[PDB]
DNA sequence: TATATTATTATATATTATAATAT
DNA sequence: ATATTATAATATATAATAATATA
């Protein structure tokens, strides 16, 4: 109902995610048991912290939704440890971006809810109340696997299909109070590059654009106006993406050839291309840079309908 | 301070603080004739 | 409240290795001498310090639990050696990470318990008390050949046998108070991942399942419900792993692959895959890793009825 | 307090090798001059450092022991040369991994102990004292051809046969005061790949077995029960070795795959893999090496009662 | 410094200890012109 | 005293190559110039370093020598060519291993003995004094054909027959001055392998029996006990060649075999075997070269005592 | 720091040497009253 | 100190030794009455 | 004097590289 | 007979610390 919805049925995410470890934890809560540790991870900008905050609020427990790179010091870590009580829960964002001292002071906490601090000098035995840490990282491959042993639950994120995207945009437009057509929801889902939280941001932007030039209802001409304004159509092709693929088909026409060469042809930084442009079409069956080189399917050619055998 | 508060301060520098802020944290919430763990716990929420 | 076998005789899971370590315990006690240097290696995270504490209990003498960063200088380890006494022991870790100056310092320390040091050149000879030098690393292969040859006993560590894994699962469920089934215990031993910690995490999660889905009861069918609602295969595959298999047999169709293309198409960090999902199946051997691209082995082909080039 | 042999006849194995080296010893005695520089090639387990020490005492010269991996810069070499004097010798091992500038420094240093490297200004004319550098590497193929050609004494060090290994076990038990049955000596000699270092280690394990489970000296029955308790068959198999055998004959059908793949499957080093495998695999004829891979023989497959398909 | 003291200081310098703390530990505990091994033992008995 | 050949009369080698280099030197001296860049592709070191020393002796100038892989940078080559004076001799072994930029810089050196480099880019014009480049490499087959096209003088080398061993016995043993029997020299040639280096080793090692025993008897077993094992049926070959014949006959049946298959069977470098053992064994008619496989001739079967397949 | 020095550095860069090595080589020799080509030649003749 | 000592220092520097400890090894055993190769030998025996 | 202004010691990270292979 | 590029090293921009003239 807010900018970020609250109830779990508001955000019908991955049906496996929506089914597993939600009804299970809803039944398991109230058993006088402190919950164990949990990861949600995937592409960035997907509001995984919002999902964890949601999980905490149907658990009805005090939560401190925190960011790891903000909390670099062990002192604020211990401050958040003494902030909560028995059987509580803590939320941290981007745990993999921390100084090691964070992890070797949270290791006794993971072990036996213990705050071992050093001051011959001797370390001091300081127990902590039972708790829960949830992990909210973009990528946790660089996270150490002692932690991966300590964290008991992992959940991944993936690009959303058009049905989940359509349901999400319809629910969030009902949150936004729009008069969008179901065809409007489908066209908004197609224009968006998945990313349901960023898709919600795009829906808010498109709603502002439509309210600037009209009412809250969404019509196919308004969708075309937004697609031409944002230079991204329902095929998801960026203007730079469309221009570069037109350049590639204008010279090699699906010819499998090397990247440096195409980067010099486009006069663009190839690493920026690597980390932005082709992954998005690479999640679909569009771009297939081979050992011989780039291969683009004729499905992408169907944007203009010209292809060769 | 007492031995408990002194050990607390030593732990505070030993985890990254400096002595004068440890001192005013102890002085803000002083502990009386009990074990160190409880009032260092209110100090660590008292420092928030 | 972590897992701990109280004695090496009480230890289960590697009954043969339990027999040789009982042999070693009786060798030290019956001869009333310091036990030989025993080389320990296996899984990286297993609570080796806990095992050393159990061995310390078996001897009845203390063991100084030390590691590579603990003994990065020869000075502090020499100080501990001076603090060592007759018939003691000293746990050492990250010996491969340790400097070669540490290695030459410990050469006379285990060479009949002596010490040689220089001061125009002068020689100073020192003696050392007899003890049992303990060398434990995650991988013993980085150790220099003369030092390991000068070392005595070598002990390999590994995850338990499938029957041993099921026995340990049954013991932990009795510790956890779960009304487990031996068929369910064998199911967990099949899904044991080679990791007793993650296995115990699985016992916790299926205990949650049997609390919320079963009537506090654990059977084979309850275990099958839990490990059908989750990422399950008796080898240890996940829907992560199933997705990797589908893409690998789908994108390049059982050929060598480009890791950048894998990360772009799969939409996960390749480092996360090669740190989490790849190494277990490499231990399973179901892939072969080439300098021109990793290809799955015949297990994936028979897993989906696929041909061989 | 060590049981290291220090006699020429102590390493009576490889009698043609020992006779040729005795001829070289009497040659150096009759020369009363600089020896030809020596590159002995031989896999470990054979006491090759002990052999270098023994021939150094037969020269009546002091020996300094180090290796090629230890050295990293020709200045360290020059320091070692200055420490050596007339009538000295320096044990060097694994010279293949060494900086080349060390090699061009040592070319005149083995020509006539000379060093004429550049400081332009005045260059050095370092003519070293008369002492001959020797090498005790494992394989000379990975050694450079100019260094292999320039060094005079070259010899293969080989695993010892059952009679010499049993005699070595008997004489070491004599130093240890222990008594061995000749049949037990024969079985432990034909086990452990016929290598005196491993033979002595096995002797220590078997005498510990006779200290714990036995009540006296070692017989054939006591030794056999020791090997069965240690899970050592007539082939001297290790548990990791049996695991590798199972993987190569089952997962890979003889294993026609490179050493990198199998070493990663074990998660162990290439050098560790080979120096375990070849000294027993080659002498038993259970695997050969192909550019496709170290594929096992039919003999290895039929060892476990498996018929070749 | 005595011969045993100088040898012990050089030994602890080669061991990685700072020369000042090595000299302090060597001159603190043992006596004068004693056996080098045992006073090295006593100097390295110190811990933090 | 240097036992190595100094003058061309002292040189022992191919008479045809000797007359060819004699007429090259006469043509150079008749032009009042140094010898031009002579290409000598064949056995590296054997008759190549000695040939460069012959060129230095005939021209009466200082000689500087290096290697192919040593000169990684063209700037180093330009530095040494600038340091080379007029008419000086340069010996580079393995000239085929140069990076192409080194060869591009080197092309004016055998064009007109000047640094006429072809290179934001400035053509440096260094005063390059005339010099003789002793082009040494394994063969001209893998040589770059601009380089092989630009060499003014081209010649070859071959492994020598027993005449070089006879001339070595005539010359260097007289330089040695100790008695050698003529038929004793002939039976020494049973293992001399037609190699001047092996002949030098035999000259150094015949003295071994003379200094162990003062009686000085000469028999066939006395001549063989320097290398007591015969290591051959007859005429030159060694234990390594014995292993080669064993793996051709017992394993590869002496018939066709992949070159890499035989190389991995030897567990040795293909290039090392092909440079050392292959050409001499082909010379005595033991192997013929075929692209489909390395098949051995009638000599290999008949010397082994078995029938020809 | 000189025009001839800069020309020598650029020539050594074009010849394959590193700019840092070219600077070290042109600073290693005190080339004075000489042309750039001959100063480069004596610099190459200098160390070697 | 003489030209042999400076040549020894420069040769040890070009060999890769650190200049301050190379200079200390040279100055500890100078070749005032003996050759540069001999005092380089004695210096290289100093740090073994 | 303490302070900005020069030295000099690690540490990933964007580079260079090769092989083997389709093509 | 080109390229290409999937794995492998590598070298320096950016962190740090230690003298040093100067109002």
Residue numbers in the entry:
A (entry chain M), C (entry chain P), D (entry chain O), F (entry chain N): 22 to 140, 145 to 334
B (entry chain C), E (entry chain D), G (entry chain A), H (entry chain B): 154 to 201
Reproduce the article's own wording on this structure:
In the cryo-EM structure of PaRuvB-dsDNA complex, the four PaRuvB subunits pack against with each other using a binding interface similar to that used for crystal packing. The intersubunit interaction involves E40 and R52 on α2 of one subunit and D233 and R238 on α11 of the other subunit. In particular, the arginine finger R175 (equivalent to R174 of EcRuvB) is located on this interface and approaches to the β-phosphate of ADP in the neighboring subunit. The four PaRuvB subunits form an asymmetric spiral and encircle 22 bp of HJ arm, and two of them intimately contact the DNA minor groove with their β-hairpins in domain C, involving resides R314, R317 and R319. Furthermore, because the β-hairpin is in close proximity to both DNA strands, we propose that R317 may bind a backbone phosphate from the first strand, while R314 and R319 may interact with two consecutive phosphates from the second strand. Structural analysis revealed distinct subdomain orientations of the four PaRuvB subunits. The angle between domains N and C defined by the Cα atoms of G165-V186-T314 increased from 34° for RuvB3 to 52° for RuvB1. The conformation for RuvB4 could not be unambiguously defined due to the poor electron density on the N-terminal part. Despite that, structural comparisons showed that the overall conformations of RuvB3 and RuvB4 are close to the crystal structure of ADP-bound RuvB, implying that these two DNA-free subunits are probably in ADP-bound state. Thus, the two subunits RuvB1 and RuvB2 are likely in ATP-bound state.
